[PDB]
């Protein structure tokens, strides 16, 4: 291992992260803290109608479009991680299949404070209470994300940090179905090393930021798991629930 390469990798990943995800933590936080006329607050059924077939199904059918596009962008990110393009195309699929939603919820955290979540690329703000007030099991989709986002946002990671942490999540050599995990671990071990260095310089006063961040990686796996389970309860009930084929492609056998 060489510090120059590890730092080259950090900077490489950051520039590629900038060039791949139009929505960064820096833009989301600038909106959330008012330093950026202003997002439209959605806190009830009526101002949801003013914000612009049941309401709960409708609040979430629109999000699919951004999910699909996040799958597109995460994929253009994974193609920039040194070594990924040469892995067996089958492992490339599996790494995106399991990685994509862990990274989405990592990025969704930037959009969240304890009180709510930015919507429509920050043109709206939908309150947590309102999401909590929805019916069926619909009003339990977002509350686990808020509890995570509050704890995760407390790490004070920035877009430099996130680029590498997200790359580490993609290069997870323990997902079901990888063909040979050996080259995946060599990439990730090295990514983990850039992270440790990255966090040690960017945050010299957060003693064990590295350990606390590794433990959030497992939190992200449980969020996806519960989320996938809630989807199963809906598919048994809501006839009005359809899913984009890319998302349906990802959720099957997950």
């Amino acid at each position: 291992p060489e510090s120059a390469d590890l730092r080259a990798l950090a900077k490489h990943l950051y520039d590629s992260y900038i060039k791949s995800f139009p929505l960064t933590k820096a833009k989301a936080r600038a909106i959330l803290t008012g330093k950026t006329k202003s997002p439209f607050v959605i806190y009830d059924m009526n101002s949801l109608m003013m914000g612009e077939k049941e309401v709960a199904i409708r609040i979430f059918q629109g999000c699919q479009f951004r999910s699909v596009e996040a799958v597109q962008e995460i994929t253009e990110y994974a193609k920039s991680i040194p070594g990924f393009v040469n892995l067996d195309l089958n492992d490339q699929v599996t790494l995106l299949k399991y990685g994509v939603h862990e990274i989405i919820y990592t990025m969704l955290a930037s959009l969240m404070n304890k009180d709510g979540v930015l919507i429509s690329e920050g043109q709206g703000f939908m309150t947590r209470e309102f999401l909590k007030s929805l019916r069926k099991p619909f009003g339990d989709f977002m509350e686990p994300k808020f509890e995570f986002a509050v704890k995760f946002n407390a790490l004070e990671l920035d877009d430099s940090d996130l680029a590498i942490f997200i790359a580490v999540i993609i290069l997870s050599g323990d997902r079901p179905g990888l063909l040979n995990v050996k080259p995946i671990e060599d990439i990730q071990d090295n990514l983990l090393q850039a992270l440790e260095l990255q966090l040690k310089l960017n945050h010299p006063e957060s003693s064990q930021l590295f350990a606390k961040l590794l433990q959030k990686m497992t939190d992200l796996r449980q969020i996806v798991t519960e989320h996938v389970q809630l989807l199963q309860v809906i598919k048994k009930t809501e006839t009005d629930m359809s899913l984009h084929p890319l998302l349906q492609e990802i959720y099957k056998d997950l």
Binding site: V71, T75, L89, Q92, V93, P245, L246, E249, I250, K252
Partner: peptide, 11 residues
């Protein structure tokens, strides 16, 4: 394989 959209998104 059976993820054909993702397969296509990669090349």
């Amino acid at each position: 394989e059976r993820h054909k959209i993702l397969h296509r998104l990669l090349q």
